[PDB]
């Protein structure tokens, strides 16, 4: 049902509410764009090149997880080759973290000051989020409260 | 007395070197909200003295043995790090 699997795909990406002619026109954009590439390298390596860029900017264990799944997905190759293409298109606690004070046999470390320095940035981002909200909540409504009479109002636009 | 001046002396009281003077490091003006937090912070430096006197009084006599050295010379690897923090 390859002629239908493109028809069901065009429904999901259609945002819910003419919804009867847009699907007819969006199926054109699906075909008008599918045959441009057709007119005109291993698989796991492309993940590692993205695994590297993970570890550099921190978040090591997540990168050790991305490789943990592709190792069990072996025991389909063309599917992961599609996900690596859309890697950047997406939209933008645990106390048993470092916590040298809990464990069975925790090894000697001495002060770190590189875990407490990335434990105050975990808090500084919190106070900087709940402050942009109050900057994006008093702005979205004062831009309407003070304007020309009848701009932001939809009933006056009739 | 500015808050910055207190931050200047405290970074010394963490070592033993004394506004803040020398068993609590009695500070001697400024507001009560400042003296209280200095008191607790200054006292941490006092501890550093008690651990320094031992590794200096017993590093003098030669009749402490062979174990009493590996102890008095393992209280120093746990002090260089405390000297790296004061650096930062």
């Amino acid at each position: 049902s390859i002629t239908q699997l493109f028809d069901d795909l065009c429904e999901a990406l259609l945002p819910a509410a003419n919804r009867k002619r847009a699907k007819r026109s969006l199926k054109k954009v699906a075909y008008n764009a599918l045959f441009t590439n057709l007119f005109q390298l291993p698989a796991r390596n492309k993940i590692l090149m993205l695994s590297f860029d993970l570890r550099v900017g921190g978040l090591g264990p997540k990168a050790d997880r991305l490789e943990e799944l592709v190792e069990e997905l072996e025991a389909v190759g063309s599917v992961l080759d599609l996900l690596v293409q859309l890697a950047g298109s997406g939209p933008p606690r645990d106390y048993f973290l470092n916590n040298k004070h809990v464990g069975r046999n925790v090894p000697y470390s001495g002060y770190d000051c590189d875990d407490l320095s990335v434990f105050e940035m975990d808090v500084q981002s919190l106070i900087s989020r709940e402050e942009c909200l109050c900057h994006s909540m008093i702005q979205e409504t004062l831009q309407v409260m003070e304007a020309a009479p009848g701009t932001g109002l939809p009933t006056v636009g009739l | 007395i500015t808050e910055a001046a207190l931050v200047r002396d405290i970074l010394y009281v963490f070592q033993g070197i004394d506004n803040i003077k020398m068993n609590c490091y009695k500070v001697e003006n400024l507001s009560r909200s400042l003296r209280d937090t200095a008191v607790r912070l200054s006292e941490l430096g006092w501890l550093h003295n008690k651990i320094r006197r031992y590794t200096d009084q017993r590093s003098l006599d030669r009749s402490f043995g062979l174990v009493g050295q590996s102890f008095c010379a393992a209280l120093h690897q746990e002090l260089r790090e405390y000297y790296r923090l004061l650096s930062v």
């Binding site: 320095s117 | 790296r84 930062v88």
Partner: peptide
């Protein structure tokens, strides 16, 4: 090689 000159640690600074 703990007797001879080694590079500085960078831990003394607040990296």
């Amino acid at each position: 090689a703990t007797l001879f000159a080694q590079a500085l640690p960078r831990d003394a600074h607040s990296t």
